[PDB]
Every structure is written in structure tokens, then in C-alpha cells.
Design a protein around this ligand. Structure first.
Ligand SMILES: O=C1CC(=O)N([C@@H]2O[C@H](COP(=O)(O)O)[C@@H](O)[C@H]2O)C(=O)N1
Ligand SMILES: O=C1CC(=O)N([C@@H]2O[C@H](COP(=O)(O)O)[C@@H](O)[C@H]2O)C(=O)N1
Lengths: 218, 217
């Protein structure tokens, strides 16, 4: 599994190149893995991935929550890996064929797929939560090794960890702004994803250092 | 929304030259183009403005928005800033995530299309069982634009029943995936067609032929 420095992944959702680059550079000594999503990509282009690689020594997880039909999913994965992303996050709710399409491209291109099971926001309780355990089981059956689970629901995150096993890699968002606790989340997740608590702080470096300090024993 | 010939082109080619050329070859048959991530992630969001400059067509950003509310808001803002007239959002992530999109659309004068049931086989695993409820959620939220599967006419008909004749419904899965143009239009206001047109030997004839099959429709 990828060796995430300090078990902390930065969710870089700022929407302008200058600010995104500044903040990421300021926390560079604490984080070597950055999650780049559509807020930044749709604002600055896929070349932002290239710029991050050039400026920082950070792995890039493209958080695109791929959720289309198999044929389109394959195209999205190809374009994303072509740009330099180390991994891509895919939704499991659209079914097994859609996930398999992503896995096939990842295998062919030598990259990784992260399967998003349950989400962290309130709305996830409406439809996703009830399908989450089966989506996770589906991931295991398909050979998925990397997963995403919610920090906001410890009981659900714990169950997801059980389903995927200790060998699987699990990252978890919802820490900080959404209410999740760093340490508690790391009881089940290999790494925590943190966005606003760091990138909106007056001193992102201090925010990152503080978060790491609170989980130093972990 | 008034879609010319009830036909929406799904432009999923991945290079600017081919995308612009093919769209230009069928421009006389359409006035609405669905642009998704295959093209956007390959050529950039500036491609939307380019399409409006060259064709003056309506642009539906098929981004199947499926994030938390906060992120959904940012995605919609960036998308509408690029010139998209509408955006497609997944309903599976819940009401709050859809509401976030509706708010931005209202603020920027755009439309939100709610994707209920999908057209591919995998949709039967989790989405289909929640589709009717997702559609009712759309009705409760005031959603007026929906997306349903051409590949399952009975499911598309049910979606139409739930949302009513007043709502706008577009449907993908026509052609390559097995859906029939005419049958799909019995329930949907417009059909979405990708490969059957942009992958055809002669895209113009494909589009012309498709419209011919639904001539008196
Ligand atoms: O269930 C999930 C999945 C996910 O990726 N995310 C993403 O994780 C990040 C959370 O950021 P934040 O720490 O709440 O500011 C954002 O980029 C979200 O889009 C989430 O919050 N919940
Ligand atoms: O359920 C759905 C939703 C959707 O948007 N689509 C999209 O509709 C288009 C269908 O293209 P095609 O006619 O099968 O080539 C693609 O851009 C898909 O991503 C789909 O096929 N099924």
C-alpha cells in the first residue's frame, strides 16, 4: 500500500492555482499525499496535477468519484492517469461493471483505484448507507484493495474495515470541518483526509502540525 | 427546454479536432450538446466556450455530480463559470447534495438535471431499487429536469409517471446500448445519442437517419 506520510492526506479543494499551490507548499513537510478533486481541476485544468508533481514531491489521488457507465468510466480513467494521477476514486453504487471498467484501466496503466463505499454527509443515509456493506463486499470480490469510508460515522467505518479486512488500504474524509476526530478515525483508517481544517486555517502548516501532534502516538 | 429534433448529441470524443469536426458535421440536426468528462478532462473546460462560439448550441455538462453538498456547490460553480447551461447530478447521494446543486443553478441562471436510474447493466445492482424514491425526492425538491434509461422502457415510463408530463426528461442508451429511438420518445422529451453518431462512418447520415426513424414523432 502507498506509504502516506503522517497518515494525513490533504484535500486540496481551493479553486485557484495560486492559493492551492501556496497552501500545499506550506504543508509539504507534513504531507506527501494530496487529494485533488473537481473543484480545483475544473477551475485550473488537468495540468494542475502536473504542476503539483513538478513543485512538490507528492502522490496524487484524483477524487473524481467516477460514477458513469463502463464505457465512459474507462475514458475518464484513461484521461486521468494520462495526466499523472497515481490513483482515482470511483463510486461503487453504479454497480460492478462500472467498477470493473476502472480496475481494468488501472491495471493496464499501472495505477490504483480507490472504491468509495459510504459517504460522510447527512444525505448518505438516504440511499448509500443501506447499500454500503454490499458495495464493500462487491469491492472485495472484484479485487479492490483501496477504499474510502466515512469518519463521521465510526460504527460504519468500523464495519467497512471488517468487510475489507486488515490488509486493504482505507482512507477516511470528514475529519475536522465535518466533525470527525483524527485519532478515533485512525482506529480503523490507514489515513485521514483533511481539507478545510487545514486549507482555510490562517496558518495551514500550523494546522497540519497540530493535527499530527494529536496523533503522534499513532 | 426546447431541444431541436428531440436529439441531444453526446460528444464523448476525446480530442478537440475530432470533437469539433464531428459536431460541425451534424450541427444542422441539433442545437443541444451534452459534454462530459471524457472531452473536458482531455481538452479542458474552455472547450465549452469554444462550442458556444462555433455552434451557439445549448450545453449540458454531464458531470454526474456525486459529492457532499459543499463540494457539489464548488463543482457547479466552476461548471457554470465555464458556460454550461445545465448540469447532470446523481440523486443517489441524497437530498442535501442535490439541493446544493439546485442553489447554485438558481444563482447563476442554469438548470439541474437529476439522474435517477442509469442505463447500464450494473444499474440493476443498487440504483434501480432506489430509482423511484430518487424521482419522488426530485419532485419534493422542485426538480423539473430528469434523466432516465432508454435501455429499460418500462422503467423510463415509470419515471415519467412519477415526475408528470410537465417535467422535462432526457434519455441515454439509445443505439449502441440497445435502446430504440422511437420507443424512448414515447416517454422522454429528448434522446441522448453518442457512439451511434460520433463513431459512425458518416456521422451526418447517422444523425439524419436517426431523425428519419422518428420523423413523425
Ligand atoms: O464521503 C466523502 C467522500 C469524499 O471524498 N469527501 C471529500 O473529502 C473532502 C473533505 O474535505 P473537508 O475536510 O470536509 O473540508 C472533500 O474534498 C470532499 O469532497 C467527503 O467529504 N466525504
Ligand atoms: O444512465 C446513463 C447516464 C448517462 O448520462 N449516460 C451517458 O450518455 C452517453 C451515452 O452515449 P452512447 O450513445 O452509449 O455512446 C454517454 O456520454 C454516457 O456517459 C449513459 O449512457 N447512461
Amino acid at each position: 500500500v502507498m506509504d502516506v506520510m503522517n497518515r494525513l492526506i490533504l484535500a486540496m479543494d481551493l479553486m485557484n492555482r495560486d492559493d492551492a499551490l501556496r497552501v500545499t507548499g506550506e504543508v509539504r513537510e507534513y504531507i506527501d499525499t494530496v487529494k485533488i478533486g473537481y473543484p480545483l481541476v475544473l477551475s485550473e485544468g488537468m495540468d494542475i496535477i502536473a504542476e503539483f508533481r513538478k513543485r512538490f514531491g507528492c502522490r496524487i489521488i484524483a477524487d473524481f468519484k467516477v460514477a458513469d457507465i463502463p464505457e465512459t468510466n474507462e475514458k475518464i480513467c484513461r484521461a486521468t492517469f494520462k495526466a499523472g494521477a497515481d490513483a482515482i476514486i470511483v463510486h461503487g453504487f453504479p454497480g460492478a461493471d462500472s467498477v470493473r471498467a476502472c480496475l481494468n484501466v488501472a491495471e493496464e496503466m499501472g495505477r490504483e483505484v480507490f472504491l468509495l463505499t459510504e459517504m460522510s454527509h447527512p444525505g448518505a443515509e438516504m440511499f448509500i448507507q443501506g447499500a454500503a456493506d454490499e458495495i464493500a463486499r462487491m469491492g472485495v470480490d472484484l479485487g479492490v484493495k483501496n477504499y474510502v469510508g466515512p469518519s463521521t460515522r465510526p460504527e460504519r467505518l468500523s464495519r467497512l474495515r471488517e468487510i475489507i479486512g486488515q490488509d486493504s488500504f482505507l482512507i477516511s474524509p470528514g475529519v475536522g470541518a465535518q466533525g470527525g476526530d483524527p485519532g478515533e478515525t485512525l482506529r480503523f483508517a490507514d489515513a485521514i483526509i483533511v481539507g478545510r481544517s487545514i486549507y482555510l486555517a490562517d496558518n495551514p502548516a500550523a494546522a497540519a502540525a497540530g493535527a499530527i501532534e494529536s496523533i503522534k502516538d499513532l
